[PDB]
Amino acid sequence: KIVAYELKTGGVLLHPIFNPASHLHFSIKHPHTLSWEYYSMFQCKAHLVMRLIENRISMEFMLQVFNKLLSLASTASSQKFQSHMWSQMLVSTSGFLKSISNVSGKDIQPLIKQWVDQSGVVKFYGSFAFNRKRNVLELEIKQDYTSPGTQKYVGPLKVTVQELDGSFNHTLQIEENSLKHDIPCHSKSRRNKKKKIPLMNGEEVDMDLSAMDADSPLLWIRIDPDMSVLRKVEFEQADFMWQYQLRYERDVVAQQESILALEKFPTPASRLALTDILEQEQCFYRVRMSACFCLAKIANSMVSTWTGPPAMKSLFTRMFCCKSCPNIVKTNNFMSFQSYFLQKTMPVAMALLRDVHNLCPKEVLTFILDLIKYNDNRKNKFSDNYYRAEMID
Amino acid sequence: NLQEFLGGLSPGVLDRLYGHPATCLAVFRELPSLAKNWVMRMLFLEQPLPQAAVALWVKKEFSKAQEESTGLLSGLRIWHTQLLILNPIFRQNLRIALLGGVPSLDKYAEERWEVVLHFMVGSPSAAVSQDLAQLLSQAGLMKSTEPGEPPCITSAGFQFLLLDTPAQLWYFMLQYLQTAQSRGMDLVEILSFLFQLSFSDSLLNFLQHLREFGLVFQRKRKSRRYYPTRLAINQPGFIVVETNYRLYAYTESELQIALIALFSEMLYRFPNMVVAQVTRESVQQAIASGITAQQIIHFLRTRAHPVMLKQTPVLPPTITDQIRLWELERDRLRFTEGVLYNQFLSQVDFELLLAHARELGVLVFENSAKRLMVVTPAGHSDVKRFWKRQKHSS
């Protein structure tokens, strides 16, 4: 939301100094002259910058800062002196930074100078190349700092590389003149023997390594995984790396960004990846709800190649319909709250299917109308208004 | 072949080359089977005839002979459609050609060719002739690079050496004509003499070169009259091959012993016989020099003693197979120049880039499973631009 708004119009400036922001058509000196979208993005950027301050100075020290502010205010709140002490209930920026420096011993003045006083987000364009001879991974990260909303980042940058030997984090120092970052790569001895490949968490899984390159061990790369800067990343992986990142990652933002990047690769391996995500309980439900729409877009792009039925129809009849009647939907029992959301989002994406003539097929429209006719809600303890409203959608 | 040589010519040189005395007859004899008769037929016609008649003038069976003869004679341009009357000049010359208008010599030719081959090989004693040496050097079978030192023998030289006398001489004369054009000697005038043999300053020099090759011999202190030898118009074997890679050759002329030593190890030399061994060392030495097993096998077969002619095949299968295997073991590893890009991302987008390097001729090997393509550095400035254009298209 904030990178869309700041690249759209100028930027949000937390803590201006009194104009400080002349790129935008109102004055930021008073709350009653702000646009309402600017007020909303102001609150949004403020809580993300506080998450960044928690990233630099750990969460227990952050809660100690907040407790110190509240304790000064509550010793202030019981005095009777007319504001000799009632102004300890008012916080400022300098007092907040001083309380942070009191509890932690680190000051955050570079982070405050970059993300508060400066009003911009950063844009990262990354591309990699694997050097087989020296066994290194040559990343190439360049910033677009000449757009109207952007600024230049010179700090450190975390990158997480999943190779066959596991998941390794690397810190890169991205100075102004930097372009190529050579990080080292590990072995490929988990392709010699079939062993399980260890993940970002402690677990390990069986991966189908037939799509991987023979010479490179690395399975996927993520630039800034923890969202530790206010950034927009445009990484150029290969399509099998996006499919491996969609399947076997233990991070929902990486699964979402792989869904978002698989729309450019309409190959049938990506259709298999999104269909395996859709069938998979123990995936987070908002990833499957995105995979519905991604599968609809991919299915629209590979018409005159699609083999069987329309997308997600057989999967809908496998998950939510009767075993004896495929075209009759099961009676509504909405007590699971994840297959309820997936059931009410799957025909909405299924209706975006189009034939070679650019008209929605009469197999999906008939399916949606049979979902509407055979709807029986006399048996669940929950209402049907959102599911029926999504059927109209 | 002479058919190839004459086919590789223009109409302007062809009609001039069709001289009255002999050419119209020498080129006629070339006509393999049927073109003789049709040409004879329409030797007396002053009126062209339709092509359909010629087409239907051969039965359905064996028509391929008709088409091949018609194509060959169309290439020779003996006639013109004129709409198939023969060329008037050729018709007149052919009508004028049809009722209109030694034991010491062969030995001399043999000895002269033998001494020529002795000079070709590294023989300390051989006939000396600067013109012959430079002619052989420019024929493509010899390179000197140093006038003071005697010229060595190139790879093609050994292959030419191992050829039989007829083909050897024919190829030598073909190269002679090709170099005659380069040096400026008129090709037509010299060529007509060869045809006339089988029945000016340039002529005198050409005849001198032919005499040096041994095809002709004036015998009268270089008089106008000449008596061509047998080779000018255009024998039992002596090697016995064992099953243990042993050759017993009844050779008295040093040329045969040298030729055998080129690909065999000599052991004994008797007055009327010589013993050699065909070992890996000698065979691979010849192969490295440039020979291939086919020439060695053909040479041994043609110079096969009558004793081993009774057995079929004449050359033992073990010897032949061993020679072939020895030649095959010679080459394994390779060499090329290339550059590799990677990360081709989209599957359907990488297939379009494969056709760009294949049409230009800079593609070595590809890979649709890993999206990898090797491009030679010679065309690197053209593939990258295409890739950039594709990226721009998106």
B102 close to A (CB below 8 A): no
Residues of A with CB below 8 A from B372's CB? Answer: 213
Residues of B with CB below 8 A from A214's CB? Answer: 370
**Best of B339, B340, B346 to mutate (most A CBs within 10 Å, chain A):** B346
Q: Which A residues, 253 through 282, put their C-beta within 8 Å of a C-beta on chain B?
A: 264-267
Q: B116 CB contacts (<8 Å, ≥6 apart)?
A: B127, B132, B213, B214
- Give the integer Cα–Cα distance in Å for A256 and A291: 9
| Residue in B closest to A235 by C-alpha | B345
Question: CB neighbours (10 Å) of residue A181?
Answer: 19
Looking at the complex, report in whole angstroms how far the Cα of residue A205 sits from the nearest Cα belonging to chain B.
Answer: 23
- Cβ–Cβ under 8 Å, residues A332 and A372: no
Query: Strand A218-223 and strand A156-163: pairing?
Result: antiparallel
Q: Which of A236, A238, A266 sits opposite B371 (nearest CB)?
A: A238
Helix B165-183 vs helix B201-213: crossing angle, to nearest 10 = 150
Q: B143 CB contacts (<8 Å, ≥6 apart)?
A: B137, B151, B152, B154
- Give the integer Cα–Cα distance in Å for A381 and A333: 8
Phi, psi of B41 (to 5 degrees): -45, -60
- CB environment B67-106: b (16+ within 10 A), e (fewer): eebbebbeebbbbeeeebbbbeebbebbeebeeeeeeebe
- Cβ–Cβ under 8 Å, residues B343 and A127: yes
How remote is the C-alpha of A144 from its chain's centroid? 21
A128 close to B (CB below 8 A): yes
Q: B345, A129: Cβ pair inside 8 Å?
A: no
- CB environment B320-343: b (16+ within 10 A), e (fewer): bebbeebbeeeeeeeeeeeeebbb
Q: SS3 of B394, please?
A: coil
- Cβ–Cβ under 8 Å, residues B28 and B39: yes
Looking at the complex, report in whole angstroms how far the Cα of residue A316 sits from the nearest Cα belonging to chain B.
Answer: 29
A343: left (phi over 0), alpha (psi -120 to 50) or beta: alpha
Sequence length of chain B is 394
* Element spanning B342, H or E: none
State how far the alpha carbon of B173 is from the alpha carbons of A20, A367, B2, B108, in Å: 96, 87, 11, 18
Looking at the complex, report in whole angstroms how far the Cα of residue A265 sits from the nearest Cα belonging to chain B.
Answer: 6
Q: Which of A213, A214, A239 sits opposite B345 (nearest CB)?
A: A239
Residues of A with CB below 8 A from B344's CB? Answer: 238
Q: B378 CB contacts (<8 Å, ≥6 apart)?
A: B337, B362
B371 close to A (CB below 8 A): yes
Residues of A with CB below 8 A from B343's CB? Answer: 127-129, 236-238
Q: B346, A264: Cβ pair inside 8 Å?
A: yes
B343 close to A (CB below 8 A): yes
The data reach a resolution, in angstroms, of 3.3
- Cβ–Cβ under 8 Å, residues A176 and A154: yes
Q: Which of A130, A215, A238 sits opposite B345 (nearest CB)?
A: A238
- Cβ burial, residue A105 (10 Å; 0-12/13-18/19+): exposed
Question: A-B interface: how many C-beta pairs under 8 angstroms?
Answer: 29
- Please give the torsion angle defined by the CA atoms of residues B214, B215, B217 and B218, in that order, rounded to the nearest 10 degrees: -140
Phi, psi of A280 (to 5 degrees): -95, 105
- Give the integer Cα–Cα distance in Å for A42 and A55: 20
- Cβ–Cβ under 8 Å, residues A26 and A34: yes
Q: SS3 of B266, please?
A: strand
Residues of A with CB below 8 A from B370's CB? Answer: 213-215
Tokens representing A201?
Answer: 């968490």
Q: A214, B370: Cβ pair inside 8 Å?
A: yes
B346 close to A (CB below 8 A): yes
Residues of B with CB below 8 A from A129's CB? Answer: 342-343
End-to-end CA distance of chain B: 58
- Cβ–Cβ under 8 Å, residues B46 and B79: no
B342 close to A (CB below 8 A): yes
Looking at the complex, report in whole angstroms how far the Cα of residue A300 sits from the nearest Cα belonging to chain B.
Answer: 16
Question: CB neighbours (10 Å) of residue B150?
Answer: 12
- Give the integer Cα–Cα distance in Å for A325 and A329: 8
Technique used by the depositors: cryo-EM
Q: B343, A214: Cβ pair inside 8 Å?
A: no
Residues of A with CB below 8 A from B391's CB? Answer: none
Nearest to A4 by CA among A224, A223, A228, A231: A231
| Residue in A closest to B348 by C-alpha | A267
A213 close to B (CB below 8 A): yes
Q: B347, A239: Cβ pair inside 8 Å?
A: yes
Residues of A with CB below 8 A from B387's CB? Answer: none
Place of tokens 């080779």: B231
* Element spanning A93, H or E: helix A93-104
Question: CB neighbours (10 Å) of residue A338?
Answer: 14
- Give the integer Cα–Cα distance in Å for A179 and B341: 19
- Cβ–Cβ under 8 Å, residues B353 and B386: yes
Q: A238, B344: Cβ pair inside 8 Å?
A: yes
Nearest to A65 by CA among A91, A45, A40, A36: A91
- Give the integer Cα–Cα distance in Å for A41 and A33: 15
Q: Cis before residue B313, ω within 30 degrees of 0?
A: yes
Q: Which amino acid is at A40?
A: S
| Residue in A closest to B341 by C-alpha | A129
Query: Strand B246-249 and strand B239-241: pairing?
Result: antiparallel
Residues of B with CB below 8 A from A238's CB? Answer: 343-345, 371
* Element spanning B99, H or E: none
- Cβ burial, residue B167 (10 Å; 0-12/13-18/19+): exposed
**Best of B341, B344, B368, B370 to mutate (most A CBs within 10 Å, chain A):** B370
Q: B252 CB contacts (<8 Å, ≥6 apart)?
A: B271, B272
Looking at the complex, report in whole angstroms how far the Cα of residue A353 sits from the nearest Cα belonging to chain B.
Answer: 22
- Cβ–Cβ under 8 Å, residues B36 and B69: no
- Give the integer Cα–Cα distance in Å for B80 and A19: 96
- Cβ–Cβ under 8 Å, residues B174 and B5: yes
A237 close to B (CB below 8 A): yes
DSSP state of B60: S
- Cβ–Cβ under 8 Å, residues B171 and B160: yes
Phi, psi of A359 (to 5 degrees): -110, 145
- Give the integer Cα–Cα distance in Å for B247 and B234: 31
Interruptions in chain A after residues (C–N over 2.5 Å): 18
Please count the helices (runs of H) and the strands (runs of E) in chain A.
Answer: 13, 9
Nearest to A188 by CA among A213, A170, A222, A223: A213
Report the side by side order of strands in the sheet with B363-367.
Answer: B339-341, B372-375, B363-367
Q: In chain B, which residue ranges form alpha helices assigned H by DSSP?
A: 2-7, 11-17, 23-30, 35-41, 51-56, 63-76, 88-97, 103-120, 130-136, 155-162, 165-183, 187-197, 201-213, 230-233, 254-261, 280-289, 293-302, 317-328, 347-360, 380-393
Tokens representing A88?
Answer: 């300890």
Q: Give CA angle at A46 (A42, A49), nearest 5°.
A: 140
- Give the integer Cα–Cα distance in Å for A295 and A299: 6
Query: Strand B239-241 and strand A218-223: pairing?
Result: unpaired
Sign (positive or negative) of CA dihedral A327, A331, A333, A337: positive
Q: A238, B343: Cβ pair inside 8 Å?
A: yes
